[PDB]
Structures are given as C-alpha cells and as structure tokens.
Design a protein around this ligand. Structure first.
Ligand code: HEC
Ligand code: HEC
Ligand code: HEC
Ligand code: HEC
Lengths: 107, 107, 107, 107
C-alpha cells in the first residue's frame, strides 16, 4: 500500500543498501544481483543475462510499487529461497522513499 | 572420450593454464573464475558465491570426465557465450592428464 | 592521441602491410589473420570463425582509434603472446593514415 | 577513449581511491605510490625519487587522457606486473571525471 516520498532520500537509501549488488542504468552490468532497469512492469526473473534462483522465477510477480514495498520489508519472507542477502528496510517511510527513487531511476 | 593419465603432469597443466582464474581446494576463493571444488557430479553453474553467465547456467551439463574433455578442447564452441577466456588444451593427452589431476584435486 | 589523416595513404599502408593477412569487406574470408569488418566498437577476439590466441581474447579491449594506434605501434608489447607477426608502424602519421582508412573500410 | 566531465566529482574520486597512495601537488611526497605532478605528457616511470617496477618502466607509455582511462580500468591488465594494488574504476564516467580533475591538479 505504497505512498510516494522523497526521491532524494531514496537515492541515498539505494546507494547505501542496494548499489553494492545492483545497478539501475539502462543496460548496466549485473553485479552480485541483477540489473534493475525496467524492473517495474516486468515479471520477477525476466532480466536478460542473469541466473535467477528457482524461487525468484516461480514467484512470477509483476513488479509494482505495492508488492515491491512488501518484498523490501522481508525479501526472504516474500520469496522464500531467494539468494538476495538482505534483511529488509523495516520502516515504511524508507521503502516509500527508496521506491520513489527506484521508479524514476529504472524507467 | 576420457582415458586416465599422469596426475603429476596434470597438476603442472592446471597450475600453468587454470590456477590464475581457478582454485580447487574445498571452500577456496573465487578468483576471475569460480572455485572448482566438487565440480564433477555437479551441474554447470551451481557454485555458491559466483555470478555465472546466462550461457553457463543454461547449458546445465552434469560435469563428468568425458564432457569436461570436450569443454576443455574449445570452451567457446562447447558453451557459446562463456566469459571463460581460454582457447583450449587441443592435445588429448593434455586434457586427460589435467582431468586426472582435477578429479582428485576437487573431490 | 588519434588524429585523422589521409585515408588514400592509409589504403596504400593497409594494402602493403596488412592485406596479406587481413580482409576488410563485410563477410570476407579469414586469411592468416581474421576478417576485420566491424573491428571498431567490438571486443578483441570476437570475430566469428576465427581461432584467436589466449592472449587476444584475454585482452578483451573494446577497439577504438586510440587503442588501435597503440596496438599498431607494437602488437607484441600491447598484447603479449599475439600470433600476429608484425613489428608495428612506428611513425604516428602512418598509424593515423592507416586507421583513418580502416575506420571507413571496416564499417 | 576520453571525454571531459565533472572535475568536482573527480576530486572526490581521487581523494577516495587514489589519495592514500598518491599526491598531486608540484613537488609532493612519494607515499606508497609516486607523486603524480606532471604525469600527463611524461613517460611511465620517469618520476624522480621513486623506485618503479620493471613492468612500469618497460611499458614506456607517454601518458595522456586516453591511455590513462585504459590504465585505470584495469591497472594489472594494462601493465602486467605493476605493484599498484588497484582493481580499477570500471565506470567510464568515473574515469572521465577523475582524469578531468587529475589533468588540472597535476599540471
Ligand atoms: C546483495 C547482497 C544484495 C543486496 C544488498 C540487495 N540485493 Fe536485491 N538481489 C540480489 C540478488 C542475489 C538477487 C537475485 C534474487 C534471486 O533469488 O534470484 C536480487 C534480486 C532483486 C530483485 C528482483 C529482481 C527480479 O526478480 O527481476 C529486486 C527488485 C531487488 N533485488 C531489489 C533490491 C533493492 C531495492 C535493494 C536495496 C534495498 C537490494 N535489492 C539489495 C542481491 C542483493
Ligand atoms: C581466466 C582467464 C580463465 C582461465 C585461464 C580458465 N578459466 Fe575456467 N572459468 C573462467 C570463468 C570466467 C568461468 C565462468 C564461465 C561462465 O561463463 O560463467 C570459468 C568456468 C569454468 C568451468 C565451469 C564451472 C561451472 O560451470 O561450475 C570449468 C569446469 C572451468 N572453468 C575449468 C577450467 C580449467 C580446467 C582451466 C584450465 C585448462 C580453466 N578453466 C582456465 C575463467 C578461466
Ligand atoms: C600476418 C603475418 C599479419 C600481418 C602482416 C598483420 N596481421 Fe593483424 N593479425 C594477424 C593474426 C594472426 C592475428 C590474430 C592475433 C591473435 O593472437 O589472435 C591478427 C589480429 C589483428 C587484430 C585484432 C583483431 C581482433 O582481436 O578481433 C587487428 C586489429 C589486426 N590484426 C590489425 C592489423 C593491421 C591493421 C595490420 C597492418 C598494419 C595487420 N594486422 C597486419 C596477422 C597479421
Ligand atoms: C596504493 C595501494 C595505490 C592506489 C590505491 C592507487 N595507486 Fe596508482 N600507483 C601505486 C603504485 C605502487 C604505483 C607504482 C607502479 C609500479 O609498478 O611501479 C602506482 C603508479 C601509478 C601511475 C603510474 C605513474 C608513472 O608511471 O609515472 C599512475 C598514473 C597512477 N598510479 C594513478 C593512480 C590513480 C589515478 C589512482 C586512483 C584511481 C591510483 N593510482 C590508486 C599505488 C596505488
């Protein structure tokens, strides 16, 4: 149940918590995790060049601001068996800010 | 088609041609290429902690002495689009010796 | 470092120093060396149908006018272990003229 | 292949990735690495008071914005056997920004 926030703060959140494993630019490299360009409006596990786990592809969730917020609260609880090593942004304002940035940075 | 050979000579072949990108010990580090412990009897692209290419995971070949010999003759021809930069041991005795060592060194 | 020059002179340079081992036309044959069509903007060792050395593929240099000039000064010094038997065009005006021609002849 | 960028950002890139081993001011001290004043337009290994490796002097590359960008992508791949312990700025924008600063800071 997403509500938009500060994209400037979300940039700092992404750079500190996600940038180590992910890239956002169109046609960026796949670090530990896959490139996230065009992640919104795309099924889970459909990034070319990345070897996803069975769980990530089987979830087949069409990413949007609402299910992304649920995913980022507890990645393991949302997709059990995900290789993404991340506890989760537990504050709702954090997820809202991060997703606000991620929406523009990946379109 | 594999035939066993000199494991002492295969160690020299591995150390000169593979050691720069690969490690064999149980729980070794992932250099340019992945750690090869337990490579035999395991699917291609199933080493933990390594980011494989799309081609290497898609091949899904269960490694054995025979398909490894074919792979090491021409890695690009066997798995088209592999990031492993290696032309290939073209002599059959070289592949047999290297695989003889690699079998013991990775079990 | 690269500066454009006489493409007419570069054609004479290519025909006298490179044409024996290389072809430039789209879909030309691989003589002693590989076909050079689309060499610019492509990684080193990515020509289809040619067996490159380990050194040429491992260099993985994205060819451009600047690194080509450095390569053509001393091919062995730039890519140690290259099977290309060529000392190198030591004059800068020579490399500039040759690359000026090679840019149009291979696009 | 160099294109100019942000010298303000390049100052931050140099201070975070290079300042530990290098100094830029005219007549600065040689830390782990040599002083880089007047590095552009000078041959590799010609800084007074510094003990370079055999590989760094043997490369004898006349430094410029283009070959520096290639060097900073992968120092070991460019000069094999360099004692400079640095993986390399893999983003092109980062090399462009750093070199833009380094050009003014070392002249
Ligand atoms: C490395 C330790 C990671 C950190 C920190 C973050 N992510 Fe992650 N991500 C990582 C991996 C290994 C994977 C693959 C998951 C699998 O099991 O296959 C992912 C995946 C994602 C996805 C899904 C993409 C898709 O299905 O197409 C998303 C949306 C994602 N990661 C987002 C994300 C964000 C926003 C992060 C910071 C809060 C973040 N990740 C951190 C590895 C790592
Ligand atoms: C670095 C330039 C390499 C050299 C030399 C050798 N290998 Fe390689 N290897 C390298 C990479 C980057 C990869 C990843 C491939 C990909 O596209 O994902 C590999 C992979 C392998 C594998 C497959 C492992 C698996 O699928 O689990 C094997 C079996 C392997 N390498 C073996 C091997 C041997 C025996 C070598 C010397 C003859 C050798 N490699 C050299 C990088 C490099
Ligand atoms: C035959 C004796 C050669 C002459 C004369 C020239 N080239 Fe060469 N070239 C030759 C070989 C055998 C190879 C393969 C190198 C290897 O080790 O795999 C090459 C390769 C090149 C490349 C690299 C192509 C790529 O990596 O895709 C280039 C750009 C190239 N050759 C250019 C070139 C030019 C411009 C020449 C005349 C000045 C020239 N070559 C001469 C063999 C021979
Ligand atoms: C210490 C761990 C280093 C870091 C981080 C960086 N550099 Fe480096 N540099 C270091 C050493 C030990 C050397 C000597 C190399 C040798 O083998 O002799 C160097 C050298 C250079 C050079 C070459 C200078 C010359 O040949 O005159 C350049 C241009 C250089 N270093 C640049 C540079 C930049 C821009 C860095 C940050 C991105 C950087 N270095 C980091 C040690 C270390």
């Amino acid at each position: 149940e997403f509500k938009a926030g500060s994209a400037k703060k979300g940039a700092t959140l992404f750079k500190t918590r996600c940038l180590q494993c992910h890239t956002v630019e169109k046609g960026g490299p796949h670090k530990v995790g896959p490139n996230l360009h065009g992640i919104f409006g795309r099924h889970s596990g459909q990034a070319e060049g990345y070897s996803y786990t069975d769980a990530n592809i089987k979830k087949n969730v069409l990413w949007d601001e609402n299910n992304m917020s649920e995913y980022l609260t507890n990645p393991k609880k949302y997709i059990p068996g995900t290789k993404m090593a991340f506890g989760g942004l537990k504050k709702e304002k954090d997820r809202n800010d991060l997703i606000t940035y991620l929406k523009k940075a990946t379109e």
